[PDB]
Scaffold this active site. Structure first.
Site, PDB file in Angstrom:
ATOM      1  CE  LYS A  51      56.777  11.491 -21.400  1.00 21.20           C
ATOM      2  NZ  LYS A  51      57.880  11.105 -22.325  1.00 21.20           N
ATOM      3  CE  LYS A  63      44.097  15.534 -19.689  1.00 24.97           C
ATOM      4  NZ  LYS A  63      45.286  16.421 -19.527  1.00 24.97           N
TER       5      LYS A  63
HETATM    6 NA    NA Z   1      55.561   7.847 -25.438  1.00 23.80          NA
END
Ligand code: NA
Ligand SMILES: [Cl-]
Ligand SMILES: [Mg+2]
Ligand SMILES: [Mg+2]
Ligand code: NA
Ligand code: NA
Length: 326
Positions: A51, A63
């Site tokens: 992320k 996911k």
């Molecule tokens: Na990001």
DNA sequence: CCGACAGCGCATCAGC
DNA sequence: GCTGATGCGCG
DNA sequence: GTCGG
């Protein structure tokens, strides 16, 4: 491919959104994340780590956590089991069959390769050729073969008019050891942004390539873009080479640098670059780069004498073709 | 939030 | 016939 | 689905 498992998953999600959901922004979102992750130089240990990369948000992070834990994604497991979704995804693998046509064929109960073959009368020209060479168009082209194809096209073009310049772009120009197809950018001094002093500039080249049996079929053809099929000649007793996709694009000669930047790609690189151009107040297409006015209307074409000039305008360091494989 | 997300050639169709 | 919308393809 | 403002 430290992160092959993850990028495959994302690519499969992307394909689902494009082919079945017909949600193109989701498709592009998944593709962007797959691309950013594919160039990440570490084996990913968690969704959180992922992320941190731009293009990877919350949903994709979860996911990636699921995938890392179990080695699979339930959402995909389910998609794989669905007949309608599976069938639609398959049909879209035929050139000329998109999401809409695929879903329509599935409605009519045409959902397998066998079905397609027995319903040829229901296909347009492009689709018929895509079906004809379905297997061949699956195969990659070794760079060694790309080199032989280059020689043929450049030499045959020279023979038509020594003033043509044919340049092979796409992944070939990016240095890849194999290519999905052959992309040819064509120029002739009689065709500029200023005037077209000769007609059939593209036709004559296409005709010559058909004459020598290099081009075998045509998917579509206009005054500036040819899309079709070609095949290397094989020697006595040799098995034939697979048929290959070929695209030829005739670009005004004074617009060569924008053209070669476009045709070199990758597609994701182009999308990133054009997006960045916008952020910087420019718009880029295969012809020109232009400033955006205060109203957000394209201004006049800026002077360009190299690919790097384009990078400069938008304040990017120059990237060689081989570093544009995103 | 919510708007934006790149840009364009050729084929096919609908409506006039 | 043309125009505009849409599908599909290319990077 | 993700991002910027
Ligand atoms: Na990001
Ligand atoms: Cl979408
Ligand atoms: Mg290519
Ligand atoms: Mg490609
Ligand atoms: Na397709
Ligand atoms: Na191509």
């Amino acid at each position: 491919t430290l992160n092959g498992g993850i990028t495959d998953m994302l690519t499969e999600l992307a394909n689902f959104e494009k082919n079945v959901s017909q949600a193109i922004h989701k498709y592009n979102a998944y593709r962007k994340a797959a691309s950013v992750i594919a160039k990440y130089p570490h084996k990913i240990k968690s969704g959180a780590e992922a992320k941190k990369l731009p293009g990877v948000g919350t949903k994709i992070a979860e996911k990636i956590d699921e995938f890392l834990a179990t080695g699979k994604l339930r959402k995909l497991e389910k998609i794989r089991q669905d007949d309608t979704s599976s069938s639609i995804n398959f049909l879209t693998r035929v050139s000329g069959i998109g999401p809409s046509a695929a879903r329509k064929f599935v409605d009519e109960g045409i959902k397998t390769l066998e079905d397609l073959r027995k319903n040829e009368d229901k296909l347009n020209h492009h689709q018929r050729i895509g079906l004809k060479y379905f297997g061949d168009f699956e195969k990659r082209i070794p760079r060694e073969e790309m080199l032989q194809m280059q020689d043929i096209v450049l030499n045959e073009v020279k023979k038509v008019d020594s003033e043509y310049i044919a340049t092979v772009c796409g992944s070939f120009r990016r240095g890849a050891e194999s290519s999905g197809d052959m992309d040819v950018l064509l120029t002739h001094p009689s065709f500029t942004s200023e005037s077209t002093k000769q007609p059939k500039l593209l036709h004559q080249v296409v005709e010559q390539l058909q004459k020598v049996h290099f081009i075998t079929d045509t998917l579509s053809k206009g005054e500036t873009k040819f899309m079709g099929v070609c095949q290397l000649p094989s020697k006595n007793d040799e098995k034939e080479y697979p048929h290959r996709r070929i695209d030829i694009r005739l670009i005004p000669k004074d617009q060569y640098y924008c053209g070669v930047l476009y045709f070199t790609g990758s597609d994701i690189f182009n999308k990133n670059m054009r997006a960045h151009a916008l952020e910087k107040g420019f718009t880029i297409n295969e012809y020109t780069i232009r400033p955006l006015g205060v109203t957000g209307v394209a201004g006049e074409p800026l002077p360009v004498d190299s690919e790097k000039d384009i990078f400069d305008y938008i304040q990017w360091k120059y990237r060689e073709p081989k570093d544009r494989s995103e």
